Design a protein around this nucleic acid. Structure first.
Ligand code: ZN
Ligand code: ZN
Ligand code: ZN
Lengths: 97, 91, 97, 25, 101, 81, 214, 127
RNA sequence: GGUGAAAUUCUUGGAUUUAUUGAAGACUAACUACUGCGAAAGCAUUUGCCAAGGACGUUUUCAUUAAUCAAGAACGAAAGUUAGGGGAUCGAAGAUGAUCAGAUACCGUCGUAGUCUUAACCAUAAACUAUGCCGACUAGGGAUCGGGUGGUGUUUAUGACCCACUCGGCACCUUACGAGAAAUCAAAGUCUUUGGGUUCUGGGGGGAGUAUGGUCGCAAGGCUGAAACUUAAAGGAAUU
RNA sequence: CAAUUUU
C-alpha cells in the first residue's frame, strides 16, 4: 500500500537532497530521512563532582559540557532508540515525549 | 560535401594500422595542425615547427611550449601553482 | 564597470580607433583618456604613456585583452587603442580620474 | 528470485548466442 | 638555488652537487618537487621523477618549471618509418632481434 | 454564503479583494501633484514610479523609484490629480 | 633501565607584557651538554594555556591562547605571541538552531611584517516582541553585513603592532563596534572572532622581543 | 602555586589510553595502556582495567615533580564514533582521588568539515 | 590494532601516542528546516566576472500572436568506454585471518579498476508525488518563503520586528461535502444525472523485453519488437 | 556472536 503520507521523509518539492553518514552501522542515508536525537544537559556527572571541586585547584565553577549532533539510521534506531508504541493512529504525533 | 564521415585527417592511411590506434592519432593529429590564439601579438597564427616550438607569424615570437599543443595540462597547473606560491615570499 | 560606458560614447561622441590616429590626435592636446588594452606591446605602451605624460591626458589601462576591446566598442573587428577626442554627452571625465 | 537476476541471466546468455551465430555465420 | 626557494615548489634541471652544470630531471616534460628542507644539516630532500626519495645538497641550483615538450608519447609511432627516424639520429639500436631466434 | 448580494458589496472591502479580482475592474494607483521647494510651478507624477522625473530649473528630484509606490523625499505637496 | 626522568631538569615559562603576571607554565627539557646542547635547541615548542590564570578574570574562561618559545636566559626565558583561538566546547555550545551563522576570513598583513588570518562568527537574535521563531536573515543581509565585517577588521593596519593588537583583542573593544556598525540591520549578538592563525614569521626579531620583560 | 601537567586522556572503544605530558606539550611522561595490565584482550575497554591505570600514572607523576594537571579528554576523533568509550568516566575520577589537582577539563576531539568517507561501504557494517 | 570472542598485520631498528612544520588529493561540517532555486536531473566554503530566469508591482506597448504535440531535436544521477593528469580516503576483482558440517558471503587487515578532472561517448534507474499538460469551479483553518498596501505599533533617522490584508510558491491539519475496491484524496471531486481542450500507454498470466528484421553506439547495450507453445489462475485492498 | 530441513 502506502503507509506514510510523506512517503519519503521531508523531501517534497525538492527532489534528491544529499547523503549523510550513520553512527554505528556506518551506512549512508538521505540527510532529511532517518533520525536525529539530542538530549543532554551536563557531561561530567555525579561520579563525585561534589568531590571533584576539592579534588581541584581553582574550583572552576562550570564543569564543562560536550555537544555532538549525531544521525542514526533507521535500522539501528529500532535496536537502540526506545519507541514502545506505534499503532495506526500514533504514527501522527509530533511531540518529544 | 562531407567526403569522409568519421576518419577526418587520418584517412591518408587508408585501410591499415587499425581502428582504435588511428583514432588515438585523430584526437591528437588535429591538435598539432590547428591555429592557436597568439597571446603576444593578439592574433590566431600559432603553428608548430617541431616538438615544442610554436612560432608566430606577425612579430615572430616563438613560445617553447607543449609537445603537441601549446600549453600542457601540467603547465596549466604549474604557472598557477607558483602564482599561488609567489605571494608567500612576499606576504 | 565601464563596458556600458564606452558604448554610451560611441553612439554619441567622436572617437578615433587604432594607433596612428591616436598619435596624430595628441599633438594638440585634443584627445582625452586614451584607453589602452593589456597585451599591447610594451614598446608602444611605455611611450604613448610618455606622450600622455606631456599632453597631461588620462590613461585607462583597460585590463581586457586586445581583441576584447573591439567587442566593447561594438566593432566586428579587433581594435587596440581608442581615443575619445570629445565627450559631448558623456560621464567618463571624472569616474576614471 | 528477483527481477534483476533473471535480467542478468538473460543479457549474459545473449552474449553466448550472438557469437555462436557468428561461428556458423 | 634550492636554499633560496620555498618548499612545495616545482624545480627543474637540478644539479647533484654545485658546479656540476645540469644533472637531474632534464627529459621531456618531467620535473621535481622539493619535499622538505633541513636548515640544520645543510641539505634539501627532493624526490626525483622516478618517485624515489633523495637527500641532496642545498646549493644545487635549479630552474623552475616543467621542461617544455611534455607528452610526446601519446602519439603512437604507428609504423616502422618514424621509428627508424627517431633512432637514426641517436644511435644504432634498431632493429633488435629476439634472442630466442 | 448560500445567499448574498453581489451588487451592493461592502464599500470597505476593496482592501479584502485584489485590484484585479473585483467585480468592475478598477486600478488603485493615482497621481501626485508635487512641487520642488526651489521652484514655483506644479507638476503631476504617477503614484508608482519608473524613470526619475525632472524639474525646470533645479532639476534634481521629485520622486524616487522602488518596487512599490514612489517616495517624494521632501514633504511638499499632494492634493489629488 | 637508567631512568631518564632524572637527568632532565625543571625549567620555567615566561610570557609577554601586555598582561598581568607571567609565571605561566613550568616545563622541563634536558641538561644542555654538548652532543646536542639544548640551550637554544628547544626553540620550537608552543604552550596552549588558558586565560583565567593569565588575566585573573576567570570569566574570560574560554578564548584560549597559544604562546611560542623563542630564546632562553639562565633557567628563564621570554616568549612571543602566537595567535588567539577559541575552544572546542563554547563554539559547540553557541550554535543553537533556528538562526544563521556568518563568517569573515580576511588575511590581514600587519603593520609590521607578519600576516595573520583573523576569522569571525555571528548569529542573529530574537528581537523580542517576536512571534516568529526562525529569526533568519534575508540571505542578502548575509552578503550585506559581510561587506562591513570584512572591512572593520582592516583598520588593524596603520598601527597596532601585535602587542597593541593584544591590547585590542583582550578588552573586546572590537566586538563592540560590530554592534555600532550593524545598526543597518542588527544591533546585538555574541559577535566573536573565534580564531586568528598566523603564517609569515619574518625573522627572530632580536630587538623587538625582550622589551616585553618585567 | 604548584606545577601543572597536561593529561591528554585518550579513550576509544576497544582500548583506553591514559598518560601525562609536560606543560610544553612535547615531553612525554609514562604512557599507560589498558592492554598491558590485563591479559584477557577484551578488558582493554573495561572500566576496572582503566581504573588503576590512572594510579600508576599518578605515582609516576607524583615522583617526578608533577602535582597538578590541565586534563583533556579525547575521544576517537576524525570520522569515528566521536563519543568516548567505556573507560572515560571510570578514569577521570580515578586520578582525582590520588592527590592531584585539576584545572580546565577540555575536549580535543576534532570533527571534520564533513568529508572523506568512512568504512563499511555505502550499505554499511552488518550486525 | 581488531571485533561478540579472537586471529591475520606493524613493533624495543622506537612502534601506538605526543608536539612541530609541512605537503598532496578528497569533501564542504555544526548551522539545516514539514524551507529556497532548477525544465527534470541535481544544487550548500567564500569573492569577482559572464549572461539568463521566477514572482511581485505599472493607468507602458503589441493586438489572438495561444494549449498539447506524430516526424525531428536539447539536457539527462550512479555504474561503464577511449586517451591523458592525479590516484590522499574508500573501494567491484583479488589475496588473507576469522565463521561454518559446507562459506572463494556476512565479520577482519590490505589492496587493483574506479570514486576526482579535461575532450568525447553511452541515454538508461524506485529519473516516484509509482497518481500526464493547459483552462475553470467546489468547506473551513493555521503556519512558512518571496513581492506589494495601510497601521496615530515596538525597538535602534532608515533598518529589523509586531498587526490586518492581498498575489504567487513548497506544503500541513480538520471534515467527508463529494469520490473510490479500500487505503485514502481538496484532488484520486464537478460521471452511468455518462462530452472544457489535447498528447502518450494497457487488454488474463507466462513464453518475453527473448527470437528475427531495422536503426544508433567504439563496446557494454539502447530504441522499435513478434509468435509457436503452456496454464486457470496470477493479482489488488482490507477482516479473522 | 553464530541456526539447516520437515513431500
Ligand atoms: Zn545506508
Ligand atoms: Zn604574435
Ligand atoms: Zn528638480
Amino acid at each position: 500500500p502506502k503507509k506514510r503520507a510523506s512517503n519519503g521523509r521531508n523531501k517534497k518539492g525538492r527532489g534528491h537532497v544529499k547523503p549523510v553518514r550513520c553512527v554505528n552501522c556506518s551506512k549512508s542515508i538521505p540527510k532529511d530521512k532517518a533520525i536525529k536525537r539530542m538530549a543532554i544537559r551536563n557531561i561530567v556527572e555525579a561520579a563525585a563532582v561534589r568531590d571533584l571541586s576539592e579534588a581541584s585547584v581553582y574550583p572552576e565553577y562550570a564543569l564543562p559540557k560536550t555537544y555532538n549532533k549525531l544521525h542514526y539510521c533507521v535500522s539501528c534506531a529500532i535496536h537502540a532508540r526506545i519507541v514502545r508504541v506505534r499503532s495506526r493512529e500514533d504514527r501522527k504525533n509530533r511531540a518529544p515525549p | 560535401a562531407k567526403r569522409t564521415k568519421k576518419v577526418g585527417i587520418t584517412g591518408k592511411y587508408g585501410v591499415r594500422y587499425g581502428s582504435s590506434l588511428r583514432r588515438q592519432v585523430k584526437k591528437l593529429e588535429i591538435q598539432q595542425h590547428a591555429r592557436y590564439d597568439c597571446s603576444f601579438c593578439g592574433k590566431k597564427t600559432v603553428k608548430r615547427g617541431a616538438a615544442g616550438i610554436w612560432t608566430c607569424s606577425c612579430c615572430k615570437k616563438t613560445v617553447a611550449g607543449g609537445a603537441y599543443t601549446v600549453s600542457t595540462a601540467a603547465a596549466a597547473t604549474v604557472r598557477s601553482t607558483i602564482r599561488r606560491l609567489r605571494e608567500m615570499v612576499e606576504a | 564597470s565601464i563596458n556600458q560606458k564606452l558604448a554610451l560614447v560611441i553612439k554619441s561622441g567622436k572617437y578615433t580607433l587604432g594607433y596612428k590616429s591616436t598619435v596624430k590626435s595628441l599633438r594638440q592636446g585634443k584627445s582625452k583618456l586614451i584607453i589602452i588594452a593589456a597585451n599591447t606591446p610594451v614598446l608602444r605602451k611605455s611611450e604613448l604613456e610618455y606622450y600622455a605624460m606631456l599632453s597631461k591626458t588620462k590613461v585607462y589601462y583597460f585590463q581586457g585583452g586586445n581583441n576584447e576591446l573591439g567587442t566593447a566598442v561594438g566593432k566586428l573587428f579587433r581594435v587596440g587603442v581608442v581615443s575619445i577626442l570629445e565627450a559631448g554627452d558623456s560621464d567618463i571625465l571624472t569616474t576614471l580620474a | 528470485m528477483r527481477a534483476k537476476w533473471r535480467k542478468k541471466r538473460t543479457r549474459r546468455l545473449k552474449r553466448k548466442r550472438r557469437k555462436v551465430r557468428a561461428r556458423s555465420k | 638555488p634550492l636554499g633560496s626557494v620555498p618548499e612545495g615548489t616545482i624545480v627543474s634541471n637540478v644539479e647533484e652537487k654545485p658546479g656540476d652544470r645540469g644533472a637531474l630531471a632534464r627529459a621531456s616534460g618531467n620535473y621535481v618537487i622539493i619535499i622538505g628542507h633541513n636548515p640544520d644539516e645543510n641539505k634539501t630532500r627532493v624526490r626525483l621523477p622516478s618517485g624515489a626519495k633523495k637527500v641532496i645538497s642545498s646549493d644545487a641550483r635549479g630552474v623552475i618549471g616543467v621542461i617544455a615538450g611534455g607528452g610526446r608519447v601519446d602519439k603512437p609511432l604507428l609504423k616502422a618509418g618514424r621509428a627508424f627516424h627517431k633512432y637514426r639520429l641517436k644511435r644504432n639500436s634498431w632493429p633488435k632481434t629476439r634472442g630466442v631466434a | 454564503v448560500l445567499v448574498q448580494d453581489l451588487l451592493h458589496p461592502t464599500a470597505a472591502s476593496e482592501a479584502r479583494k485584489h485590484k484585479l479580482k473585483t467585480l468592475v475592474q478598477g486600478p488603485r494607483s493615482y497621481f501626485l501633484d508635487v512641487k520642488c521647494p526651489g521652484c514655483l510651478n506644479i507638476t503631476t507624477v504617477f503614484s508608482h514610479a519608473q524613470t526619475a522625473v525632472t524639474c525646470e530649473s533645479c532639476s534634481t528630484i521629485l520622486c524616487t523609484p522602488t518596487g512599490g509606490k514612489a517616495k517624494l523625499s521632501e514633504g511638499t505637496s499632494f492634493r489629488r490629480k | 633501565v637508567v631512568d631518564p626522568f632524572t637527568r632532565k631538569e625543571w625549567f620555567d615559562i615566561k610570557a609577554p607584557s601586555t598582561f598581568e603576571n607571567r609565571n605561566v607554565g613550568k616545563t622541563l627539557v634536558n641538561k644542555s651538554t654538548g652532543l646536542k646542547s639544548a640551550s637554544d635547541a628547544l626553540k620550537g615548542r608552543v604552550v596552549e594555556v588558558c586565560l583565567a590564570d593569565l588575566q585573573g578574570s576567570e570569566d574570560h574562561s574560554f578564548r584560549k591562547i597559544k604562546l611560542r618559545v623563542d630564546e632562553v636566559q639562565g633557567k628563564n626565558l621570554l616568549t612571543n605571541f602566537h595567535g588567539m583561538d577559541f575552544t572546542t566546547d563554547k563554539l559547540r555550545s553557541m550554535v543553537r538552531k533556528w538562526q544563521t551563522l556568518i563568517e569573515a576570513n580576511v588575511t590581514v598583513k600587519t603593520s609590521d611584517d607578519y600576516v595573520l588570518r583573523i576569522f569571525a562568527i555571528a548569529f542573529t537574535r530574537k528581537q523580542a516582541n517576536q512571534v516568529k521563531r526562525h529569526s533568519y536573515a534575508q540571505s542578502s543581509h548575509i552578503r550585506a553585513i559581510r561587506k562591513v565585517i570584512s572591512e572593520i577588521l582592516t583598520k588593524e593596519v596603520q598601527g597596532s603592532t601585535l602587542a597593541q593588537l593584544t591590547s585590542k583583542l583582550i578588552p573586546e573593544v572590537i566586538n563592540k563596534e560590530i554592534e555600532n556598525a550593524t545598526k543597518d540591520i542588527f544591533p546585538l549578538q555574541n559577535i566573536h572572532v573565534r580564531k586568528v592563525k598566523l603564517l609569515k614569521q619574518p625573522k627572530f626579531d632580536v630587538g623587538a622581543l625582550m622589551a616585553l620583560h618585567g | 602555586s604548584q606545577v601543572f601537567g597536561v593529561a591528554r586522556i585518550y579513550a576509544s572503544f576497544n582500548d583506553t589510553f591514559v598518560h601525562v605530558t609536560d606543560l610544553s606539550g612535547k615531553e612525554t611522561i609514562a604512557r599507560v595502556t589498558g592492554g598491558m595490565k590485563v591479559k584477557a584482550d577484551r578488558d582493554e575497554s573495561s572500566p576496572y582495567a582503566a581504573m588503576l591505570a590512572a594510579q600508576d600514572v599518578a605515582a609516576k607523576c607524583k615522583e617526578v615533580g608533577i602535582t597538578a594537571v590541565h586534563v583533556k579528554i579525547r575521544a576517537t576523533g576524525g570520522t569515528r564514533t566521536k563519543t568516548p568509550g567505556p573507560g572515560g568516566q571510570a578514569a577521570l575520577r580515578a586520578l582525582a582521588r590520588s592527590g592531584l589537582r585539576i584545572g580546565r577539563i577540555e575536549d580535543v576531539t576534532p570533527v571534520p568539515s564533513d568529508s572523506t568517507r568512512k568504512k563499511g561501504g555505502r550499505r554499511g557494517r552488518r550486525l
